[PDB]
Design a protein around this ligand. Structure first.
Ligand SMILES: Nc1ncnc2c1ncn2[C@@H]1O[C@H](COP(=O)(O)O)[C@@H](O)[C@H]1O
Ligand SMILES: Nc1ncnc2c1ncn2[C@@H]1O[C@H](COP(=O)(O)O)[C@@H](O)[C@H]1O
Ligand code: PRO
Ligand code: PRO
Ligand SMILES: [Mg+2]
Ligand SMILES: [Mg+2]
Lengths: 496, 497
């Protein structure tokens, strides 16, 4: 019917109601797996089409590798298998007959693809090799599952590239990272912070991991929104991906891998949804505009149909709801997230105008028919997009606090902020901060029931350090390493 | 690199060489699973884009349901689970720990989707409900795996529709079947025969199954190319998919399901490939035209202009100006990979203001005056290639369908590589009789035997269009025990994959 708990009253219950009552998602009888209904899958198809077109400009090609991976392949890279083992699902029988060797469901495809890379790459003329696939992924998550954010089966693209040099590899890492920033900001109207993961948080077998971090204002938590890894020669040495180089010597290839998943949808909903339900960014909205005739009515009906037809020919995803009272119809499409409603009533036609209502702010205003067109409606949709992004970015920036000392850090953390702290890289320092922040923290009942914690973890070391204050005289948060002077700022906070 | 085994010499070895040396597919260390390389996956993406656009016109919407299904759901429809049980893969462990509840990988999604259909459908106003998904599926095939044709993981679309009446459901079955025909003929240049499966061959839980049958001329085998099922109320009764109708009664929904897979690619290759390698139908060719300068400043600029004009016209074109490679080497390189049209730009031809074209399917070479060169005229050549590929295969298929009124005629036509039209009266026992008896009297190649195939004939389909078939008068049932069941249609029987 409608949403009966406010977003700030019970966040996880609000989330469940919004994603199901909007017809985005349904629950399923396999734990941690969910059903993507049409309006929801439309968002992921929209991301696919945009991202596919951008990586084609880079020479990346789509492929499909198998779902299954052998134990022998999985166990090839030391760091990788150790970091993924407990989350690997194993097929052990077919029908009633046991397999000779159990085989695993892919948690990620490095060990599935790279034996082929070693065969296909023989010369520098075979490089760069840049492949991508849109697939499903299985990770038997131990943490509490969260729709979209953390599902046991999820959908992604994973790109895997091999290069003759580190310089080419580095360039791709940040090129893809910019593309992930563009998916979030230009399609989903979600602002991001680009950064590098600390040593403790980076991908197993990577030399370094970059990330686009996102912020959930309601409970003050970050979400790792997508990652782009430089694997160096770590995987090519273990899988023997070698090539006859320019210096006539045999060299190991430099590799990257990068992935973006349906976690995007959860961030979009958690950022933009409100107490009336979904609020869809126009460029991924299954329906961008709904036209509602307010109901002698013959003329009004024909003008209503012409408005619909003009928008449809312009390529706007438009619906005509000529079914029920206006108020009931209004709630119907508001719950489902439609960005713009056009109301055509008799009083409006007398003044040669229509009434518009934008979902993100609820503002209502009139537009003269002389100003109505496919292009002017598109401009309204772009204005909504910009407002949604600008609002979220302003809130995010206000909720990032420079905390030079521990008391500032704990205060900002417990009031739902992310923190920029003086940082000197150390696994021991990161663990110290995680433990001490947890001990001095408090979180909502909803977060506690969701299996979340009040601990602060490292989110990223932001790429752009230019707006941050001076590090002079600042002390390490970890007293045992007081002599290791902070040499950058790191973003820490609570997370999913 | 080249194909060193001929298509007619050793079909399975030819097939392996063509799919790997063209960079379409690679083998993998899990039996029955294969790697789809870029040029190959491009064909399936091309099918996806065409088919998705067509079903959208019908109101079908894309979704995504989970990979996993519970034992409880799977066992809900009796016939369905009995027909798939031996092929279902089971997840039983995570990490080092046995799961308390094993879960299965989807062999097909009826039992995954229909509990939700029962929730989403409440009134006739909720109907029709038409959903589709592009997914991977797992069937732990007992038969020997065949790249594309029969893999243990394959990729498909599966559509699932529910209607208020049988009439609406029947109409959709044949609308989708026509779409499968169009995929094969208009994209893949493969001719099809539409028909209904016999009772013994139809989908488990279906009221009837329709099919597009295709023909592999080299070993005289049919391939079931895609299927469109009417499920009647069999699944809606078991999953309680009910609705309040207009007359205020409670009724079970009528349902269909229909699926087309990457088997399409295998049929495309087996039909069109030759002794030089892949032969790609132009509308799924990763590269439709390759432009090759014979090496010069003027010639280079004209070569680039040809490339630019074709690219602006939306043709998928490549310029092969690689330096340390001979022209003949370049020719073989792209012929092996299946490019349908090659343009050679040499100094002698440009002096006469013309270019040399070579079409992959027949190998014919001919010149085109630059005054006639354009995006449209090159597209016309590509469409001519497409029609030729389709017409050649259809002519070959039709010549290999023989009307066999008696058992001796049937065996003779079967052993000389034909499909056979036989007098037919539906009966599971008659079909089993024909299969067993033909197996005893048939012989197949070593290549087919090694591929896990059989020389036995099975029912392929009862063709929908019987209008060209001769009279059944005086013909006897092929099954002597059922002589009292008089033939009342013609059925297509033959060897198959
Ligand atoms: N359980 C999950 N559900 C959804 N997306 C996930 C999950 N785990 C990781 N991801 C996404 O997968 C990609 C790689 O994550 P990671 O290997 O943790 O860097 C990123 O785009 C993540 O957002
Ligand atoms: N093992 C397989 N590999 C590839 N395609 C298959 C396989 N089994 C069935 N198909 C395809 O899946 C769809 C359904 O097949 P069936 O359930 O036999 O009607 C059809 O389009 C078949 O061609
Ligand atoms: O799982 C990951 O994080 C990396 C990036 C995509 C493929 N593997
Ligand atoms: O497996 C089959 O044959 C049917 C058609 C697609 C969905 N299930
Ligand atoms: Mg993880
Ligand atoms: Mg089968």
């Amino acid at each position: 019917e409608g949403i009966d708990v406010k977003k700030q009253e019970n966040f996880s219950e609000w989330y469940s109601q919004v994603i199901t009552k909007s017809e985005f998602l349904d629950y399923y009888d396999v734990s941690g797996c969910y059903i993507f209904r049409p309006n929801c899958w439309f968002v992921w198809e929209s991301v696919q089409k945009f991202f596919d077109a951008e990586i084609k400009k880079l020479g990346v090609q789509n492929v499909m590798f198998p779902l299954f991976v052998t134990k022998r392949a999985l166990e090839t890279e030391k760091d990788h298998v150790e970091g993924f083992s407990p989350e690997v699902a194993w097929v052990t029988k077919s029908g009633n007959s046991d397999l000779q060797e159990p085989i695993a469901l892919r948690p990620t495809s490095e060990t599935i693809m790279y034996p082929s890379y070693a065969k296909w790459i023989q010369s520098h003329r075979d490089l760069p090799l840049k492949l991508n696939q849109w697939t499903n992924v299985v990770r038997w998550e131990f943490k509490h599952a969260v729709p979209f954010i953390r599902s046991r089966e999820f959908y992604w693209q994973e790109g895997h590239s091999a290069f003759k040099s580190k310089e080419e590899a580095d360039e791709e890492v940040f090129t893809i990272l910019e593309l992930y920033k563009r998916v979030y900001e230009e399609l989903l109207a979600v602002p991001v912070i680009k950064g590098t993961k600390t040593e403790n948080e980076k991908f197993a077998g990577a030399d370094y991991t970059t990330t686009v971090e996102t912020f959930i204002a309601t409970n003050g938590r970050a979400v790792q929104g997508g990652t782009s890894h430089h694997l160096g020669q770590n995987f090519s040495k273990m899988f023997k991906i070698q090539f006859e180089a320019e210096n006539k010597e045999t060299q190991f290839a430099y590799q990257n891998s990068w992935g973006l998943s349906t976690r995007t949808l959860g961030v979009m909903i958690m950022v933009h949804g409100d107490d009336k339900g979904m609020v869809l960014p126009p460029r991924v909205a299954f329906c961008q505009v709904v036209v509602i005739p307010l109901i002698d009515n013959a003329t009004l009906v024909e003008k209503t149909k012409e408005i619909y037809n003009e928008l449809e020919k312009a390529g706007i995803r438009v619906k005509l709801d000529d079914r029920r009272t206006p108020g009931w119809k209004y709630n119907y499409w508001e719950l489902r997230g439609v960005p713009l409603r056009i109301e055509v009533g008799p009083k409006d036609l007398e003044k040669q105008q229509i009434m518009l209502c934008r979902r993100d702010t609820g503002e209502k205003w009139t537009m003269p028919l002389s100003e109505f067109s496919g292009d002017s409606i598109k401009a309204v949709l772009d204005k909504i997009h910009d407002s949604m992004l600008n609002k979220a970015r302003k809130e995010m920036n206000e909720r990032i606090v420079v905390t030079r000392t521990w008391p500032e850090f704990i205060k900002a953390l417990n009031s739902g902020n992310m923190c920029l702290i003086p940082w000197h890289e150390s696994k021991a320092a990161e663990e110290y901060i995680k433990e001490k922040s947890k001990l001095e923290s408090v979180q909502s009942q909803s977060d506690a029931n969701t299996g979340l914690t009040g601990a602060a973890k490292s989110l990223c070391v932001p790429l752009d350090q230019s707006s941050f204050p001076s590090l002079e005289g600042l002390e390490n948060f970890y007293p045992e390493e007081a002599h290791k002077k902070p040499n950058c700022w790191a973003l820490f906070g609570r997370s999913y």
